[PDB]
Every structure is written in C-alpha cells, then in structure tokens.
Ligand binder design. Structure first.
Ligand SMILES: O=C(O)CCCC[C@@H](S)CCS
Ligand SMILES: O=C(O)CCCC[C@@H](S)CCS
Ligand SMILES: [K+]
Ligand SMILES: [K+]
Lengths: 374, 97, 374, 97
C-alpha cells in the first residue's frame, strides 16, 4: 500500500460531457485516451480504497467488504502495469483494451456486494446515529467513483473496441449528442409499467408535457448519457406507480395519471414527475436517501440521485402528505457545464471518517416534557 | 494510592435542574477524552442535553450506568485519568497538579 | 462576562405549542411563568452573546454589532435582578412585567440593526467563501433566538399584562388553537396584493384549494401563532406576485393566477404556493437563503424559513427554470410535536466559529479545462 | 544562520501535472499551520486542487504570489518555521531534526 498511498494523494481529473464529446467526435485518438486512462483509473481506485480502509473495523471486517477491496487491489495492480508501457507499440494498446474489459467484468457485482456488506454489518451490529451518517458519506462517494470508472471505461471500449456494427452509431461512445428527453421518459415509463402491471395487474397512464423556453415548439434535447437518465427516470416511475396503485386499489375512484413536465431554460433541464399516491411525511423524506433505512436492495433512490449529481445535476423530492409527491431531476442544459463530480481523498475526507460524536448544535426536548397543566 | 484522577460530577446543566437521567454514554472506558467531546446525554424534564467533556484525559470508569434515572446534582458519574497506563488501576471498584 | 459565561453554559429549555397552550388555557399561573422566564431569558441571551463574541473581529467591530451587543448586555443585567426577588411579593410580579415590556422595546430594532452590521461589513471588507457560511450559520441562530425571546415575552405580557379588552379573546396569548389556515392565506395574499398593485398597477388573482385527509370536507385548522404563519405566507406571495407580474408585463397573454394548495395529513400541514413567474435556475436557489447575496434588507426568505423551522417545520423552494416556482411551508400537524428549535451554545457551536477553510471533499474542474479537440 | 526552517515545494498534485498556477493563498504570514490545513488552490489544466499543509508549523514567508501562473514542479512556494518567534527573521528576503 505504498503505491496506494501515493496514488490516493493524487487528485482526480474531472471531465465534462463537452470534453468527452469533443474528444470522440473531433479527435478520437487512442494514444491520448490510454495515456489519460492508465493514470486516471488507478488514481480513482486509490482515492476510494483509502476511504474504504477508514470504515469502522466492524464494517471493514465483513467478507463482502474484503472482497470488494481485493477486487479493487487486483484492478489497481493490473492497471499499474501500463505506467511504463509505451503507446507507440499498438500491441500494448490492444492488451490495455483487454484489461479494461477484464476489470469492468470483475467490477460487475461491486454495487450489490458492497450492499451485502453494509446489510451484514447492520443486521449484526445494529443501526446507530453518527455511524450511519458516516456510512452514508462513504457510500455516496464510493458509488459515485464507481459510476465514474464505468463511464471512463465505456468511453474507451466503445470508441476503440473496434465493434464492427455498433448498436447506436450516432452516439459518441455512450454519449448521445441529441438525446431526446421525452423518448427516454416514455421508455423508462413503459418499462416500469410492465413490471407494475405484472405484479399489481394494473398501472397508471403516463402524461408528458414539455416547455422549451430556449425555443417553445421544438422537442427538448440534451447532450447526455441516455442510460443514466433512463436509470433515474425508471426509479422515480417505479415509486410513483407503486404509490398510486397502492392508494387506489381499495377505492372506487379510478387511477390518476403519473404526470411529467420537462422544461429547458438558459441553464437547467428539469424533469418533474408528479403522482397523487398520497404523499410522505417530511420527516420520512430525508431517510429515503439514507442507505441503511433501506414488493418490487433498496438503493434505488440514493443511487439515482448519485447519477444526477454526477454531472453537476441533482435529484429532489417534495411531498404533500395526504395527496402526492413531486420528484425533480435537474440536469445542466450545457455540456460545457456538466463536469464529473468526483470524491477526492484528502484531509477533509479523512476528517469525516474520524468524526467522533458531538453535542447537538440545537436544542432537543425531553422525551417526557413537563406537564404544563399540572 | 490510586493513580492521579478526576471525578466528573453531574452539574446543573440548566438553571432549574436538580437531577437528571443518564440516558446514554457516548464514550467507552479506555477512550481518549478531548475537551469538548460529547460525554453523555442527560435527560431532564426540560430537555435532552449533550453533556460535554470539560477536561482532557482518558475514561477510567463509569460510576453511573445508562438508564439510571433521577441522578441528583453532585453525583459522581465517572472517573477520568491523565494517562492510559492508569486505566487498569480502576477496574478495581494529589499529584494531579 | 463571568455571569455570561455561566449562563451561556446553561442549556435552553425548548417549549412546545402544546405546553404554551396547556399552560395558558388550564393553568395561567403568573408565579410559574415568572420563575420560568427570569431564568430562561438570560439563558437564551447569554447563549447568543457568546456566539456574537465569536464573530470575526472585522464584523464584531461594526458599530451596529456593538450596539446590538450592549442592548443584549443591558437586557441580561436587567433580567438578572430578579434571580433573588421572590414571586410571593406581587409587586415584584408587576415590575418584572414592566421590565419585559422595556426589553421588548429595546429589542425592537435588533433585526435591521444587525442587518446594518453585516452590510457595513460586506461593503467594507468584501464577500468571501468560508466567512459567508459562517455568518450564515450565525444569523440563522441569532434571528431564531430572537424570534424565541419575543415569543416568550409575548406569552407573558398577553397573559398577565391585564389588558382589559384584548384584540383576540379566543387566542391564548399569541396562540390560536383553531387557526384557520385559508383565512391566514387569504389575508397574507390581500396584503401582498395591495403592495403589488400599488407599484405595478396590477396583480395576480389568488386561487386556494384544500385537502384535509384527516377529514375531507372540513376546513383545515391548526394550533399555531397566526402572525408567524402570516409572515411566511406574505413573503412567498410577495415573491410570486413580483415574478408573475414581471414576466407578463410585456406579454399579450394575461396574467396566470398564484395558486395555493393547503393539505393536512397524519403529521404535516403543508402549504404550497405555485406561480408561473418563469422560475429560477437551481444554482441560484441555495443563495436565496444566504443573507449576504441579499423594487418592493432582503432577509425575507431566510427569516421566513426561520419561522417555519422554529416549531419543527420547514420552508422549501423548487423551481423549473423557464416556467415557475413552488414554495412549500411544512408545519407540524400536532401541537404536541411542535417544539421550539433553539440555538444552543456549546463546543459544537464554538467549532463552527473556529473552522478554518479546508480542501474541498469533492473535485473541482480547472477554469480553463484542456481543449479535447486539439 | 537563518532559524530552522522547511521549504514547501510544489509537488505534482496529479500524475500528469508539470506546472500549476498558484490561484490563491489560504493562509497568512504569521498563521499557525496544522497538518492537513488548506494551504493554497493550485490550478492546472485538469483541475483546481486544494493543496494541503503536509507539516505543522507557522507560515514564515510566501515565495510565490497569488496569480503566478505556470509555476514548475519543485519551485519553492513558501517557508515554514517551527516557532513563531522565528517568523520575523524571514521578512529579510539543520537543527530542524
Ligand atoms: O487530460 C485531459 C483531457 C483528456 C481528454 C481525453 C479523455 S476525454 C479520454 C476519454 S476517456
Ligand atoms: O419549565 C417547564 C414548563 C414551563 C411552563 C411555563 C411556560 S409555558 C411559561 C410560558 S412563557
Ligand atoms: K487525493
Ligand atoms: K449552552
């Protein structure tokens, strides 16, 4: 772990959608990409690994965590072999490509393997206050870095993997320069609908409105990675369909639609999914994104919000208890403003793992407050 | 005799407090104690109060266990020791300048 | 400041709406109230004062800050005179009542005097990163404690001031046990409308819907302090009317209404104010509550949200850039759950004032990112 | 000679970095320096990087001012001193065991 210390001390290089796009469209030079990736991937893994060693020992101990850790170690070492292998040999270029595939595969089960880890740990050591927010901090960071490894590898393999007949030929690697939002909305809806109908024997209708303030009649389009957006929309539709269908399964009313507004402004692309599924009290909202309070692995909402924040977007929920809930995805309108947001290991990060519980800042009532009548 | 040591007494944590419940220890025997660390939650009739470590050391022993209700003011609550060598000496229950 | 150290080390006693109500309706014993307040008010002032001494010296220096500080000192000392004056003498009871009036008056200008302070400081030392969030932290706490002094004093003076013919006789001090929400909504609207019409020569119509999941047809009522709720609604209506009127003043369209949904569930009373005033990009939202980024003193949104959080409620905004904005006030449905939320001075608080800037946790791009085409 | 002192050199803060702009000092001459405090923002072509204090001390002098672009690796950036007495000695521009 001397190599890990050193690489963990390196800072990630966040890339923008613009850069990915400009690189794949205009340039598409494998040398450049390899030289970038042979350094960037170990940097990213080492930053994450350093944080995994800061977990409480009771969590670090779980076989699942250990397995994840050795998978990363194994990837880091395999990548480190290229530090002094020259791009001028095209042979090296080819093997590196194979190594990328090899580590994408090896990392296929990371998300649920980690999930198993923290479940193991909770159902064996219990749910505590400060530790929870600590694991929260860690998982956001860990799953984001993981999304980003996958992004980088996919760009390289799609662009240089030499795929004879590629599924989406207008796409640039995994980036759609003219991603049509309503299409992804409809697709995500149809696939939630299918699962909802399978189990509940019924599902709400979708309604979609657009408002393009940029140019009012014209279909709303974004430069984006469709399957990220797909993923986000799918999770929200699944929730909205389940809430709606559960609320009306005993009512004579007839099921309300699940509505979508898509808007495009000078800087935000916004997508608001609205349902009348009865809503959620405010106190339960923040917990919807807390991994370890979590019919149809409940990491769906927190992960989706990680996809949104990953390119400087965000994902937010607002409910009215008694009526319904709005979920909004915000994306940057401009590819030039859509930078990767990456967890950087440094002293700031270290401090979060070493935070000992502190007195509350703000008052807390007694759980048996004095009876003011007597 | 015993090694140099401090006794943590339950202050009135609010102007009308005459006793409190020790609702939760936030430190373990053996653990380092920095000034201002959270030590315990004290519950009264008025509030739930984060009681802070006033002096740095190491937690030597807990004289009052979690859950004990109505602990009066002045009751000793735990023992604090300057050096971790000395924690052992206290599982048995003024050079402190 | 030995007395200030000691009192600043005392913990506030947060009270609930239930307690205020139970006290005024069933009990209403002046002795009890005086004994409580003679201790609680100095506690609260001392907790705040201690935090004001932790401000940066450049802000501490401003005459306005110094003035506020000596006003508090002067109140603290006046209150401390009652520590050993017995309630059995009804004379003491009367003078204490006069002292409360005296300090409510003295504190009349605190909000804008402090505001002057931080403006003085900004326009003379500039807007910085970490310091800003520090002042933010401070003002939230300071203005909340201030709202709470005022609450406590008002309860005592309204209940024991001996007012022969009180304005609202069904009210218990300042608390309305059957506060009808739509009425406060309509009132707040009408008074924003008047100011908006005065300047813009036009104003949107209000539309109000209710959904009482508790009991569907029945008007929605809450145990609450009407003028807090009034204050919140007024600020939101003012914003919504200004946004709407500004957007349509050059359009042939005809002005959209400002809509209000009021809902009541098992635990939340929610009030959503919606306008089609064109919205606000996400990046500008968080700043709407940052005191020092702030026609028709811009502390209105941050203060309103302080009123909501003061009884465990909250105030949130969600916009769609290009279309409009939703603002939601959440209140607790149950008086038994509506505790004061009070700033407690302790080491946790101290730490916020002594936070030295730290490296960002997460990556930041270059401001001139490498051109990936070249 | 001069009092015992450390020179802070600009590391490669990222594997491909060969130079950077010193975009902002986050410490003042005179100020205490704890390990891990933020020292400066370094800007490259790739990122804006919070550069951290690696060793504890007191900032003695800034050898490179805010705004200096393209500072190469190895360039000394500032001087750190063990004791605050010694800061004075440096406005003039190995017992350090
Ligand atoms: O470094 C810097 C620019 C990097 C451009 C190449 C990236 S976009 C490779 C695609 S994974
Ligand atoms: O202490 C405790 C209970 C306090 C009850 C009296 C309060 S409600 C006075 C009104 S300001
Ligand atoms: K790092
Ligand atoms: K206190």
């Amino acid at each position: 772990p001397k190599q890990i210390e050193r690489y963990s001390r390196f800072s990630p290089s966040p890339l923008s959608i613009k850069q990915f796009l400009d690189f794949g469209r205009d340039n598409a030079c494998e040398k450049t990409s390899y030289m970038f990736l042979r350094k960037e991937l170990p940097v990213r893994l080492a930053n994450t690994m350093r944080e995994v060693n800061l977990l409480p020992d009771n969590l670090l101990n779980r076989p699942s965590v250990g397995l994840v850790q050795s998978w990363y170690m194994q990837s880091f070492l395999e990548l480190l072999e290229y530090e002094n292998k020259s791009p001028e040999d095209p042979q090296v270029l080819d093997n590196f490509l194979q190594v990328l595939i090899k580590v994408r595969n090896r990392h296929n089960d990371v998300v649920p393997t980690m999930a198993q880890g923290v479940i193991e740990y909770k159902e064996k050591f219990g749910f505590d206050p400060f530790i929870s927010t600590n694991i929260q901090y860690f998982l956001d960071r860990f799953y984001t870095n993981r999304i980003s490894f996958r992004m980088l590898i996919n760009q390289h393999t799609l662009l240089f993997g030499g795929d004879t007949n590629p599924v989406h030929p207008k796409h640039i690697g995994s980036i759609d320069p003219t991603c049509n939002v309503a299409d992804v909305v409809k697709d995500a809806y149809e696939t939630a609908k299918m699962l909802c109908e399978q189990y509940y024997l019924v599902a709400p209708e979708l309604e979609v409105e657009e408002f393009n303030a940029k140019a009012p009649d014209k279909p709303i389009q974004v430069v984006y990675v469709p399957s990220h957006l797909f993923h986000m929309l799918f999770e929200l539709f699944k929730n909205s369909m389940r809430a709606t269908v559960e609320l009306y399964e005993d009512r004579k009313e007839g099921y309300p639609a699940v509505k979508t507004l898509v808007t495009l402004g000078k800087e935000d692309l916004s997508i608001k999914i609205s349902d009348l599924g009865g809503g959620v009290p405010l106190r339960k909202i923040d917990r919807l994104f807390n991994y370890m309070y979590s019919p149809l692995f409940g990491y769906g909402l927190p992960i989706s919000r990680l996809y949104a924040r990953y390119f400087q977007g965000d994902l937010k929920l607002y409910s009215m208890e008694g009526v319904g809930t709005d979920a909004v995805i915000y994306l940057k309108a401009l590819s030039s403003e859509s930078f990767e947001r990456l967890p950087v290991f440094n002293k700031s990060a270290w401090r979060h793992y070493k935070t000992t519980p502190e007195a509350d800042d703000w008052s807390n009532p007694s759980s048996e407050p004095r009876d003011a009548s007597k | 005799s015993y090694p140099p040591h401090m006794q943590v007494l339950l202050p009135a944590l609010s102007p009308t407090m005459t006793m409190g419940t020790v609702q939760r220890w936030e430190k373990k025997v053996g653990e380092k104690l920095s000034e201002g660390d959270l030590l315990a939650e004290i519950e009264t009739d008025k509030a739930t109060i984060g009681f802070e470590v006033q002096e740095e050391g190491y937690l030597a022993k807990i004289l009052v266990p979690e859950g004990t209700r109505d602990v009066p003011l002045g009751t000793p609550l735990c023992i604090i020791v300057e050096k971790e060598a000395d924690i052992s000496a206290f599982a048995d229950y003024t050079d402190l300048k």
